[PDB]
């Protein structure tokens, strides 16, 4: 009775040609998306990105796609990402601790993807429908 859906977490990080006035050396972007041909918005209520507390307003909420944060800075960190589901039964959300690493000047930019498969056992009829609308496999 299980439905499987796929998330792709990822980030890009590039050394700026010129640091910001604050001395920020890199531009980076972190995201959650589905695979090609999917629509995770049917089952995802929101994605919450928890930045390092050196960032202002570090709890970044995306209620609609694209589920992403674009920032600048000078060091990588572990970035908790919560994906909240439009589900009334457990699990209500999932947390991923994402390795937002940066590379040195003179090295290629970073462009990584982390693929997660979610397996919903015995979803409710309403959540089963949402998972299938998103592209999930029964
Ligand atoms: C308008 N403006 C400049 C901003 O909104 C802004 C301010 C601060 C920052 C920012 C970025 C960083 C940053 O890269 N911090 C890292 C991230 C990990 C870490 C660990 C220890 C010390 C610093 C850091 N700190 O502050 C980013 C911004 O976009």
UniProtKB/Swiss-Prot annotation:
<feature type="site" description="Histone H3K9cr binding">
    <location>
        <position position="54"/>
    </location>
</feature>
<comment type="subunit">
    <text>Component of the super elongation complex (SEC), at least composed of EAF1, EAF2, CDK9, MLLT3/AF9, AFF (AFF1 or AFF4), the P-TEFb complex and ELL (ELL, ELL2 or ELL3). Interacts with BCOR. Interacts with CBX8. Interacts with ALKBH4.</text>
</comment>
<comment type="function">
    <text>Chromatin reader component of the super elongation complex (SEC), a complex required to increase the catalytic rate of RNA polymerase II transcription by suppressing transient pausing by the polymerase at multiple sites along the DNA. Specifically recognizes and binds acylated histone H3, with a preference for histone H3 that is crotonylated. Crotonylation marks active promoters and enhancers and confers resistance to transcriptional repressors. Recognizes and binds histone H3 crotonylated at 'Lys-9' (H3K9cr), and with slightly lower affinity histone H3 crotonylated at 'Lys-18' (H3K18cr).</text>
</comment>
<feature type="region of interest" description="Histone H3K9cr binding">
    <location>
        <begin position="102"/>
        <end position="104"/>
    </location>
</feature>
<feature type="domain" description="YEATS">
    <location>
        <begin position="1"/>
        <end position="134"/>
    </location>
</feature>
<feature type="region of interest" description="Histone H3K9cr binding">
    <location>
        <begin position="74"/>
        <end position="76"/>
    </location>
</feature>
<feature type="site" description="Histone H3K9cr binding">
    <location>
        <position position="99"/>
    </location>
</feature>
<protein>
    <recommendedName>
        <fullName>Protein AF-9</fullName>
    </recommendedName>
</protein>
